[PDB]
Amino acid sequence: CVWGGDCTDFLGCGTAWICV
């Protein structure tokens, strides 16, 4: 749940930066 990222936090919420 951020914006301007590569991956996803929760889907529908926003992106995520670092993901596994």
Question: How many C-beta neighbours within 10 Å does residue 16 have?
Answer: 15
Angle at 2 between CA 17 and CA 12, to 5 degrees: 105
- Cβ distance 6 to 17 under 8 Å? yes
For residue 14, give both structure tokens: 């926003």
Q: What angle do CA 7, 3, 5 make, to 5 degrees?
A: 30
* CB < 8 Å & 24+ apart, contacts of 8-15: none
CA 18 to centroid of chain Cα atoms: 8
Give φ, ψ of 16 to 5 degrees: -145, 165
Yes or no: say if 7 and 20 are a contact pair by the CB < 8 Å rule.
no
Q: How far apart are CA 18 and CA 12, in angstroms?
A: 17
Method: NMR
Handedness of CA 17, 11, 1, 13 (dihedral sign): positive
Say how many residues make up the chain: 20
